[PDB]
């Protein structure tokens, strides 16, 4: 079986094009998870520029892309990542234009 | 835990009238999770808003995709189990059927 363990929002990086580390905690130690993108009720045109997020695991596989360009829109990808012995993992998250302060996120999917 | 397959949603014919999508080629009698995805779509190639909802015929959850620029949502997940023939059915509805963009879902298993 498979299930959604919990939903987490992506961080909002401070600087355009410069990745920040997002740490996720509270999961089972030494366990494989799959992350998929999602967002709810966002106005991506509240100010100028385009919301474009990319996220990868520091150690793992996959890239999540959320590109809200109005004639070429993408929500795709996944991340495969394993927790450490403390139930945590790190992602690298980059916003192409950091003034886009909309909220997006991912589901954390687990075997059961 | 991985994506086994990605499949496109059907494009229903009539606004607000659900149609059945059958997914095949999966493991028999196995639980899957579905989450939405799409690539390089122009949701403004014509007038009206792309708004899709999908639910399993047997299972739970709803995927919602509302590309309204004022209130954009790409969300929800479906839990569904295949029959003994590796298939399952979804019920898919477009609010405005003239929006013929392509969207879809991941099929996830462990």
Residue numbers in the entry:
A (entry chain B): 7 to 118
B (entry chain A): 8 to 117
From the paper:
A major factor that limits the expansion of shrimp cultures is, however, infectious diseases from viruses, such as P. vannamei nodavirus (PvNV) and M. rosenbergii nodavirus (MrNV), which have inflicted heavy economic losses. The Nodaviridae genome comprises two single-stranded positive-sense RNA that encode the capsid protein for viral capsid assembly, the RNA polymerase for RNA replication, and the B2 protein for host RNA interference suppressor. While the shell domains (S-domains) of PvNV and MrNV contain conserved sequences of 62% identity, the protrusion domains (P-domains) and N-arms show low sequence identities of only 17% and 43%, respectively. In this work, we have determined the cryo-EM structures of T = 3 and T = 1 PvNV-LPs at atomic resolution, the crystal structures of the P-domains of PvNV and MrNV (PvNVPd and MrNVPd), and the crystal structure of the S-domain of PvNV (ΔN-ARM-PvNVSd) in the T = 1 subviral particle (SVP).
The PvNVPd forms dimers in two crystal forms with the asymmetric unit containing one dimer (space group P21) and two dimers (P212121). All structures of the PvNVPd were refined to resolutions 1.17–1.22 Å. The structures of PvNVPd from two crystal forms are similar with a root mean square deviation (RMSD) < 0.3 Å; and residues 250–368 were resolved in both structures. First, the crystal packing of PvNVPd (P212121) reflects the intermolecular organization of the two P-domain dimers with a bending angle of ~110°, suggesting that the existence of this putative conformation in the T = 3 PvNV virions arises from the simultaneous rotation of A/B dimer and the translation of C/C dimer. In the interface of this parallel model, the three turns β1/β2, β6/β7, and β7/β8 from one PvNVPd monomer are in close proximity to those of one symmetry molecule in the absence of metal ions. Notably, the sequence of the interaction region (Gln273–Asp278) of MrNVPd is distinct from that of PvNVPd, and two types (P21 and P212121) of PVNVPd structures do not exhibit the X-shaped conformation.
